[PDB]
Write an enzyme that holds these catalytic residues in place. Structure first.
Site, PDB file in Angstrom:
ATOM      1  N   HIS A  12       0.752  -1.262   0.000  1.00 47.90           N
ATOM      2  CA  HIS A  12       0.000   0.000   0.000  1.00 47.90           C
ATOM      3  C   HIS A  12       0.774   1.299   0.000  1.00 47.90           C
ATOM      4  O   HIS A  12       0.168   2.345  -0.168  1.00 47.90           O
ATOM      5  CB  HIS A  12      -1.014   0.009   1.151  1.00 47.90           C
ATOM      6  N   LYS A  41      -4.595  -9.954  -7.742  1.00 47.31           N
ATOM      7  CA  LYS A  41      -5.328  -9.299  -6.661  1.00 47.31           C
ATOM      8  C   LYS A  41      -6.317  -8.349  -7.335  1.00 47.31           C
ATOM      9  O   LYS A  41      -5.914  -7.531  -8.152  1.00 47.31           O
ATOM     10  CB  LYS A  41      -4.402  -8.529  -5.718  1.00 47.31           C
ATOM     11  N   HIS A 119      -3.794  -2.942   7.501  1.00 50.89           N
ATOM     12  CA  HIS A 119      -4.682  -3.157   6.347  1.00 50.89           C
ATOM     13  C   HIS A 119      -5.192  -1.841   5.818  1.00 50.89           C
ATOM     14  O   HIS A 119      -5.326  -0.868   6.559  1.00 50.89           O
ATOM     15  CB  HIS A 119      -5.882  -4.055   6.659  1.00 50.89           C
ATOM     16  N   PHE A 120      -5.463  -1.829   4.520  1.00 50.51           N
ATOM     17  CA  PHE A 120      -6.095  -0.698   3.888  1.00 50.51           C
ATOM     18  C   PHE A 120      -7.577  -1.020   3.760  1.00 50.51           C
ATOM     19  O   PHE A 120      -7.939  -1.961   3.057  1.00 50.51           O
ATOM     20  CB  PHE A 120      -5.463  -0.392   2.528  1.00 50.51           C
ATOM     21  N   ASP A 121      -8.426  -0.245   4.438  1.00 51.17           N
ATOM     22  CA  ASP A 121      -9.852  -0.575   4.475  1.00 51.17           C
ATOM     23  C   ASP A 121     -10.694   0.087   3.391  1.00 51.17           C
ATOM     24  O   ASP A 121     -11.578  -0.560   2.809  1.00 51.17           O
ATOM     25  CB  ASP A 121     -10.450  -0.258   5.854  1.00 51.17           C
TER      26      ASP A 121
END
Length: 124
Positions: A12, A41, A119-121
């Site tokens: 990210h 992905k 994490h990237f939400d």
């Protein structure tokens, strides 16, 4: 082994470019950051701010995560990001992506000590 914090950086973080991101950016970056090794992905966001600025989000606006957990944080300021979304005609191993630059607030999940993004939400 790769820590969750390191995995977040690999998936990210892209501080090296301010925004720009050529039409080729996602094709190149999804591959180079190893997000196309086992499958394409489907969606992934890269953030073009300093690591310190993204890490700082873990002390910013606490919001619910999409999965219902409580450890997500929304940036007070907009950030330069690039959205990568797999094209309809993309076929593994030849993963193909649409590259979209935006300036949005990011939402990240944070964990650990130190408390850092893992994490990237979402972007909003």
């Amino acid at each position: 082994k790769e820590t969750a914090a390191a995995k977040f950086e690999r998936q990210h973080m892209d501080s090296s470019t301010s925004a720009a991101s050529s039409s080729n950016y996602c094709n190149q970056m999804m591959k180079s950051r190893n997000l196309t090794k086992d499958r394409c992905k489907p969606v992934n966001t890269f953030v073009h701010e300093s690591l310190a600025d993204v890490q700082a989000v873990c002390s910013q606006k606490n919001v619910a995560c999409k999965n219902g957990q409580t450890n997500c944080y929304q940036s007070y300021s907009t950030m330069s990001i690039t959205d990568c979304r797999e094209t309809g005609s993309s076929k593994y191993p030849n993963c193909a992506y649409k590259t979209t630059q935006a300036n949005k607030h990011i939402i990240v999940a944070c964990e650990g000590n130190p408390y850092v993004p893992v994490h990237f939400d979402a972007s909003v």
